[PDB]
Amino acid sequence: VQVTFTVQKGSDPKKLVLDIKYTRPGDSLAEVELRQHGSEEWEPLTKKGNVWEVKSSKPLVGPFNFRFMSKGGMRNVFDEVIPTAFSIGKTYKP
């Protein structure tokens, strides 16, 4: 029950594009949301291809938290996963 997030080329201060590997024996990923530092909304990531993306009209403020829903109905919340100053091509694990 493991997740890594690698920042993909194409991310910028208003846009994160993430390759997310989600291992959970017998289940698999259905949904992912980001929550910015000190913010109360969960913002869905949209699956584009085999990566996930979320855009903002303002720069995103981190560190960023993430919530997952598996196709099995299992939900996890991981806090402080990725710093504001992320780097493209770096992998991050909660």
The residue written with tokens 């780097």 in the block is: 87
Question: How was this structure obtained?
Answer: X-ray
The token pair that represents 63 in the structure block: 């560190």
Strand arrangement of the beta sheet that strand 51-55 belongs to: 46-48, 51-55, 15-23, 2-7, 91-92
Asked: is 1-94 a CATH 2.60.40.760 domain? The reply is yes
Is 81 in contact with 91 (CB distance < 8 Å)? no
Q: Which residues pair with 29 in a beta bridge?
A: 70
| Domain ranges (residues) in the chain | 1-94
Q: SS3 string of 6-37?
A: EECECEECCEEEEEEEEECCCCCEEEEEEECC
Is 2 in contact with 52 (CB distance < 8 Å)? no
